[PDB]
């Protein structure tokens, strides 16, 4: 009886085109805020943040006011899209093909004209995603909101603190906070300035998944590449082991190339770590080739340079703690035995060259172990957020 | 004649904005429920549940009432979207870019004003998908529904049991049940509380497909890694077999990484099982390198430590039940034979070192077999739902 | 002059809400049918059938009637969506995010009120896709259609034979037929029953593509695995060949896992055939390891069990049709020759062990050939539709 | 002043439902055509042609006529969708989920009532894509257009030549032409026939990309498979080379399987060429196994059949142009030398068997070279359009 | 009070169909421009440029004028889509399924009738993407804009400089500039010409990511292929190394084939560089086979041609700076020693053939190093933009 009469009196002469203020010269105050429910996806390749957000706009409408004594029990009214004036607040850095992803809902309005409008939405926004320190990265994704066509002389956009009380954690991102800032900017379109309200979502990557799928797999494969330095040369499988580990390393390099944006603003930390690992395994194949040359050295070839027999077989070999008819028979058997003696001297030279290969294996075992550890530790702990990651996520 | 007259009388002065109650101060009771027809997809990567649902809302409309004696044969009427008041019940945790995925249909209304509204829909909802016990997991996906803009003082949302009579089974998920609960919650938006009705779909993963594509393939590949301990060392193919099985293991690790969400709330069971398997095969490559060092040991190198000739060649080798001119000719032939004797002693030392490699193969064959069985059995039967899975799905 | 006057008289007092019958108590008869133009896609992973369909609804409208003598040349009229009453027939098992995929078009209406409505559409429907016999499978995909909100007391849905005259064949599916059936069902929503009309599309998979991409590639790779039994052991490439063929077999297992739905209602025929093939190649690697143990057997190790020298070197080797100073010189040369004699006896034992490996190769060549043929033939001809496939598609 | 007055007079009593003809009994002539701007994509897997098209419809409207002397400067008027009658011409073989992909724009109308309507659009259409001769294929994709609900007694659809003046070439398809044909067909829906206008886009695949990504890579890999016949047997890498080239061949077979539709209307040319190449490399692995059996033949085994020592070591080896105490010492040394002599005869037999392997390598080098060339040339030049391709694209 | 009165007076008799000019014979001037905010994506495979753009249209409306003295404080008004006349400016080369991707917003209008309309949008446009010089390419993507249905006699489209003040850099593309040009063209549709305004976005690819993911990985793999020329032949791993590096090269060839459009307008620079690298590694496998033939040459086979013993073992070997009863015993031992002597001469011939293989390794090491460097440098520095790339991006 009363709800029917109010809806009829409130729409008399109403115009959703008119900005709802008593004095046309003043700007209309609009308080903007939002509630962050869920971070659905951070698309590092497309540089897009997907979020589930309820936006919160509130203002006063001069013409949507009634006396609750004259409409008993009628304290709030509701209006759908197009039936009352709303602020046309849009996400400026939308990455949605439709641009505006807001699902339109009612505007709630109480008897003093106070209007509340909380349209839900799944929003996609453009966010520079800084992959310099990935997977130990912190991202600061901006969500810029402002009236599209109402400047500051017409619409006084004000900011209120973001709501995270109903926020649902994500398993890949720890929300650090959603600080906001109201700015007043000029655009070359217009002489009037246009206020906006930007919310910056500070979200920290959780690193357990990436530790177990990217960082830890790489360390063990790096350790496998050092088993080439422990394989005997006579096994015949050093290059197979080494080059196969190297082919195992490209699957990870393509996994990173597939998830990282194709940008030149910097080189990700993961890229520097995988590139260094692949250069340490790629250099262990180069060293393996040199080792095999020493092991398979032709004894009747060039003698061992004196610099080599001291640098390897003395210094490094100490540091590593390795260490008438009867005369014709005589002539003929002497040839057989002398042939054996020549084979022993050639064999001794071969064993001497083989021992050099063993020393080079041990040296480059130690050398590549130090390179792996320092590069692994140095690259990973160069990230500002590495210590925080191992404390919280491990 | 009568259907035409009723549709004309029923819309006189009607307003789809007005909540349809006789006394404005009372809230309107709305019974919400749903019918689960089909679970279309559980997206574990995007944390999204897709379902085919008919929602069921029912209420009374004070103004949609007629006397069937005055409209003979006219017992029900129908109204499309926007022509009569409806409750704006929305899925709160929608994951649809449009947010609201409901296909709007008629509202059926009989002569006493009882309104029935059953819009079908394909819904996408946000569901925390707990992959801790995957593939023997049970999921509890919530579907939260409530009026967006009508609080409890206006809309008394009530719950009714979910319908599963027309439910069509899925081959990957056994519906355990769809219990629902009506809750009354406060939000920082509003001083009035807002009732909602949540339905939790309890669905058990069926594990035959994952047994045959993830778990069983892994067991056999684990068994293949133990064939390296049975390959003779002289074959020249131990590292090839071992490292190739290890490269066969990464295809599965990338298959899991591709279907699992990138989260740090826990490590899936499948991840722990594949990671342990890859550490058992990766450790069989380390042990294989040690075996080859023993087999290819230089006889003129360091002698065998006394601890090694007892631990392996006595204890473990028993447990495993393995086990003037004529003088110049004399001098020259004595060298040939003594050279042969030195070769036999060197060969005996080599065979002794080769026998150690064989014992180490058998020990690590048994040791890695126990590790594989205990890790396989221990990790799999640590799942609460493993026994149920093998009973129902196998 | 007359078309303008008819469109004006026909809309006087018309209501698209009113069901178009003269007697409100009777149900309106609606004949439903469809024309199948093209099967666009059978999505076995998502269990979705895509089809290009024109639906065919026809009924009578009491108020859309004129005398063609009074409107010369005006024999048919046309009305767009929302301007005249239509039946709200929907696909019940729609898999489209919008649910209703029908493109709305005109309703044609002649002078006696007969209405024809043929909206085209690309439809996606939920279809249980039975992959038990894939790729020799026949599918029976249902398309359930009925009025959403009009029960049987209001809408007498009747069925007419499906049109396939304009059907365009697909290269993967031979349409067997589109039988339909009208059913009358009750739902827990409603006390009134709701008729529906279901069309079952019986479509046979054409198997040439899958013969050439799945079945034939697998047979040849199975034959390659038997070449390991023909490779000499001294080549050093048996495990490389065997395990490489095994790695070639996983690419196919992942191709099947990617196109098959992740369901536990059964194991596909292709899964049983590839799993058996991979178990025959995986068992040829196990047997290869045993062969290499025989070939590389240490002659100074355990002697050959008497059961082995009869089972292999007699039975199977027949079946397969294989088959003062002068005394010091004397002492020293006798050692050299006796050392040679011991080497010959050790070599004879080695050749004896090598011959056992050759016999085992031939036995397991024959044994695995029979297993491959019987498993290949047995699994493939266990399909009811295998004989039909080779007759029609090959 | 005049544009305002014309828009007001022209809509008086106008009805967009009425077909715009003076005599209702006559059909309305509509000239249909189109402008082909760009071929966006030919989807061979989904059998869908995407094109950027402007459609061109023109007709006369009896009621949209004015005297330009009475509306000075007003020579054309414009009307948006729904405000004037339009022909409901649709693409019949649309593959778009919405079915109708036309972007609606104004209808231009001059003073004699002539209406021009050029809606742009991105269209997806169903096109049988004949992959028999891929990548040297020519496709004839039909675009069928006709009024959905207006038959020939109401709408006289006429055809005009297609415009390609603003056509923008594509790098994969050379437009050969867009011939059109107007047809008059009957459908089982209706007793009246329905004219349509079909345009067939004849487009020739440009083959440079596919020459460099499919055909040329395959030829070189085929040539690599012949290097197995040049590898010495003592290298120990024949199977590794051969089987690795075979694994290199499957990456291409899966690339083709991924881009080709899963159809059984024929076997593509590329499929026959890759299948023959893989059977020539797969047969070079079989022959390699036979070669290794000859090379590793046990000298104490079965003698060489006389047919083998003539067919290979005579004929083919000519064609290929290959080619008291002193008596105890005597007894003992005679054994040593006779043992050497037996080793030489066994070695001579081994070298004889090794020479057979070399001849078989050279024969099968020549034989597989001829097979590769004839199969490569024969399969490729069996395409009708191969000569055109190498002339235009190379 | 005044905003309400202006919105009411301004819509009296207004028609959004009427072009807003005082004199109908004159064309309406419209200034078109745009603001480039962000380049979202350059799709080289689909030939589509995605951009975030605000379009800027401005014109005068004769009927939207008021005296601000009569409406105090009312200086601007706003109108939504369909309520006032707008120019129907469309992107001509749109690649969006909807064609028009513009998000409609208000038109701002001040008291002298000046209208400003800045609809945002995410636009997809067809752009010929010239991949000839990829990854050192510069692209010139056109965005053609014009009124769809208003020709030059009605709509005088004028151009204004593009705004890039709010442009946000992209990590893959450096915006070089957005020059625009206004053109007046004729179309076969129409006798009247139709102005358009085209903006060409000149964007330079940033090459760090592609240097590290495509170019640098390829160089090192090319260097690895040269390690085959340093591996000793006795290692038994030359083909394994060589062919494995060749299989490592196909992963890159498929990565390029996946991101490049399938076009025959040219061969990309990356394609020529990878194809040359794969032909240098593929030719190092051919040369490796020849080397192994020399190393494994049968000493009892054909002698070394005199041309070979000079070209390799003299010239190239200097350039490279490589370098009664007692008579029976006598007869028997003479055989043993003469057998040894024959083995030494055969061994000397073998070592001579082995030395040739070593020289060929060193020659082809140097030769392939020069080929790699010249092909690497020559192909890369043939790009006009290579020097700019290394200066700016490295
Ligand atoms: C093509 C066929 C290739 C393999 C078979 C021919 C090998 C010939 C051979 O040497 O056989 C040997 C064994 O052979 C047998 O006795 C059994 C042969 C049949 C095995 C079937 C395997 C099929 C593999 C298909 C692969 C397809 C892969 C896919 C292709 C794209 C012959 O033995 P032998 O040395 O003559 O014995 C000497 C006997 N003596 C002591 C009396 C002297
Ligand atoms: C505008 O109105 C004011 C007061 O009503 C008047 O003085 C002024 O002349 C008007 N301007 C025009 C251009 O008519
Ligand atoms: Ca992420
Ligand atoms: Ca699932
Ligand atoms: Ca299919
Ligand atoms: Ca194509
Ligand atoms: Ca790009």
């Amino acid at each position: 009886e009363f709800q029917r009469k109010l809806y009829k009196e409130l729409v008399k002469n109403y115009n959703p085109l008119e900005r709802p203020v008593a004095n046309d010269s003043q700007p209309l105050t609009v308080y903007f805020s939002l509630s962050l429910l869920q971070i659905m996806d951070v698309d590092e390749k497309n540089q897009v943040l997907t979020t589930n957000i309820w936006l919160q706009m509130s203002w006063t409408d001069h013409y949507l006011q009634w006396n609750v004594s004259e409409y008993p029990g009628v304290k709030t009214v509701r209006f759908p899209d197009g039936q009352i004036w709303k602020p046309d607040i849009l996400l400026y850095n939308s990455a949605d093909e439709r641009f505006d992803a807001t699902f339109h809902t009612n505007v709630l309005v109480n008897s003093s004209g106070h209007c509340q409008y909380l349209p839900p939405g799944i929003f996609k926004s453009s966010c520079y995603i800084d992959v310099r320190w990935f997977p130990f990265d912190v991202q600061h994704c901006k969500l810029k909101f402002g009236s599209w066509s109402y400047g500051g002389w017409s619409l006084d956009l004000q900011m209120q603190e973001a709501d995270i009380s109903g926020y649902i954690p994500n398993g890949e991102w720890d929300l650090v906070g959603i600080p906001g800032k109201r700015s007043e900017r000029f655009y070359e379109c217009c002489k009037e300035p246009y206020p906006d309200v930007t919310f910056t979502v500070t979200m920290r990557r959780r690193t357990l998944y990436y530790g177990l799928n990217l960082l830890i797999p790489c360390v063990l494969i790096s350790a496998l590449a050092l088993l080439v330095f422990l394989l005997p040369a006579d096994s015949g499988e050093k290059i197979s082991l080494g080059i196969t580990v190297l082919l195992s390393l490209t699957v990870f390099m393509l996994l990173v190339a597939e998830i990282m944006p194709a940008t030149s603003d910097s080189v990700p930390l993961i890229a520097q770590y995988f590139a260094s690992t692949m250069i340490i395994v790629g250099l262990s194949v180069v060293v393996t080739v040199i080792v095999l040359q020493y092991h398979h050295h032709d004894p009747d070839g060039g003698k061992m340079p004196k610099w080599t027999r001291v640098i390897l077989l003395n210094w490094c070999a100490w540091f590593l703690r390795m260490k008438p008819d009867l005369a014709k028979i005589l002539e003929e058997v002497r040839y057989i035995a002398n042939r054996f003696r020549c084979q022993d001297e050639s064999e001794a030279v071969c064993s001497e060259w083989k021992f050099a290969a063993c020393v080079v294996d041990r040296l480059c075992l130690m050398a590549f172990s130090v390179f792996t550890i320092i590069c692994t530790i140095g690259i990973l702990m160069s990230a500002p957020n590495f210590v925080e990651a191992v404390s919280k996520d491990f």
Side-chain angles (χ1 to χ4, degrees), chain A:
Chain A
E1 183 177 79
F2 296 117
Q3 186 169 202
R4 188 158 269 190
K5 178 184 176 169
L6 184 60
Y7 279 116
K8 217 187 171 161
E9 168 58 39
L10 285 179
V11 303
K12 299 294 187 291
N13 297 314
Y14 190 95
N15 198 340
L17 292 186
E18 157 158 30
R19 180 173 53 89
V21 296
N23 190 6
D24 290 316
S25 315
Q26 293 323 118
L28 177 60
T29 302
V30 166
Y31 307 87
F32 182 80
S33 183
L34 69 81
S35 313
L36 174 57
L37 281 297
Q38 192 158 53
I39 292 169
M40 300 146 87
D41 173 67
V42 189
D43 194 335
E44 297 97 353
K45 189 66 177 173
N46 289 284
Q47 300 272 296
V48 177
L49 176 67
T50 318
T51 53
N52 184 20
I53 307 289
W54 312 341
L55 306 175
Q56 313 179 246
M57 308 172 213
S58 44
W59 60 96
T60 300
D61 186 309
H62 185 246
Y63 310 102
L64 297 188
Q65 300 174 7
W66 61 98
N67 179 3
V68 177
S69 302
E70 304 190 47
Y71 296 97
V74 192
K75 288 180 177 291
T76 55
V77 295
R78 280 160 206 75
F79 288 99
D81 181 65
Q83 287 215 46
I84 62 148
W85 186 92
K86 284 199 291 191
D88 60 68
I89 283 152
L90 302 172
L91 183 71
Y92 271 50
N93 54 313
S94 184
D96 193 82
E97 63 185 342
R98 309 162 288 165
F99 203 76
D100 179 30
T102 300
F103 171 74
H104 293 190
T105 53
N106 287 324
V107 173
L108 188 64
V109 187
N110 76 5
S111 63
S112 73
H114 279 79
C115 302
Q116 177 166 10
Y117 173 57
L118 279 84
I122 304 309
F123 296 74
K124 292 151 53 59
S125 73
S126 293
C127 166
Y128 169 68
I129 295 288
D130 187 1
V131 291
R132 170 61 191 82
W133 299 115
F134 177 91
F136 313 93
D137 50 303
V138 182
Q139 299 296 344
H140 307 261
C141 283
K142 298 163 79 72
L143 303 174
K144 185 190 182 181
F145 288 99
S147 194
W148 195 247
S149 57
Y150 292 82
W153 308 332
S154 282
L155 196 148
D156 186 349
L157 198 61
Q158 294 304 341
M159 182 193 57
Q160 299 186 324
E161 296 166 359
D163 179 323
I164 50 157
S165 66
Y167 172 75
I168 298 89
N170 186 340
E172 183 178 2
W173 295 96
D174 279 311
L175 179 64
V176 178
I178 180 153
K181 181 188 172 55
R182 186 251 196 208
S183 315
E184 183 65 26
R185 166 166 180 186
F186 286 92
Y187 301 85
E188 315 285 339
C189 71
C190 319
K191 300 294 187 291
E192 170 175 24
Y194 275 74
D196 75 272
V197 168
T198 309
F199 284 99
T200 305
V201 186
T202 306
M203 61 184 70
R204 189 189 69 81
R205 196 182 296 273
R206 298 178 70 187
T207 61
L208 185 60
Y209 176 89
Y210 297 100
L212 295 174
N213 284 115
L214 295 174
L215 301 176
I216 291 159
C218 185
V219 172
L220 297 172
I221 211 168
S222 313
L224 293 171
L226 295 174
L227 294 171
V228 179
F229 300 118
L230 292 157
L231 259 177
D234 286 314
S235 82
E237 320 190 74
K238 283 172 160 289
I239 296 291
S240 68
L241 183 48
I243 209 74
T244 299
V245 166
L246 196 58
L247 275 66
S248 67
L249 295 174
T250 76
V251 63
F252 267 62
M253 150 179 57
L254 298 166
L255 181 42
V256 172
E258 186 46 48
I259 62 170
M260 293 288 83
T263 59
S264 301
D265 273 332
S266 58
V267 185
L269 180 139
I270 194 76
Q272 302 162 201
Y273 166 62
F274 288 169
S276 66
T277 296
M278 286 191 75
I279 291 157
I280 288 156
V281 176
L283 281 167
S284 64
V285 169
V286 169
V287 173
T288 295
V289 167
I290 298 175
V291 161
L292 288 170
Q293 287 174 233
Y294 270 75
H295 180 80
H296 292 293
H297 189 271
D298 180 15
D300 296 331
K303 294 179 179 179
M304 185 179 288
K306 181 200 306 171
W307 63 265
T308 318
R309 213 183 296 213
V310 66
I311 293 170
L312 284 165
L313 272 49
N314 297 350
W315 299 350
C316 295
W318 159 87
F319 178 72
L320 304 160
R321 273 79 187 178
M322 281 168 64
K323 272 52 185 176
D325 290 22
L326 197 60
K328 300 176 183 179
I329 307 174
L330 171 52
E331 282 169 16
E332 274 308 323
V333 301
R334 194 169 256 163
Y335 165 76
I336 291 155
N338 284 347
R339 180 174 169 285
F340 283 135
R341 283 185 187 96
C342 288
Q343 285 170 339
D344 285 323
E345 305 289 276
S346 182
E347 184 178 1
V349 170
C350 279
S351 76
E352 189 276 331
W353 277 100
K354 289 164 185 307
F355 184 37
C358 295
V359 171
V360 171
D361 291 330
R362 183 66 59 84
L363 292 170
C364 309
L365 170 53
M366 184 185 269
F368 280 64
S369 300
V370 165
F371 298 154
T372 317
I373 293 165
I374 299 298
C375 286
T376 305
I377 289 168
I379 298 174
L380 295 176
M381 293 177 71
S382 52
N385 283 68
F386 176 81
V387 175
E388 167 163 13
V390 305
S391 64
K392 289 181 179 208
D393 298 310
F394 285 78

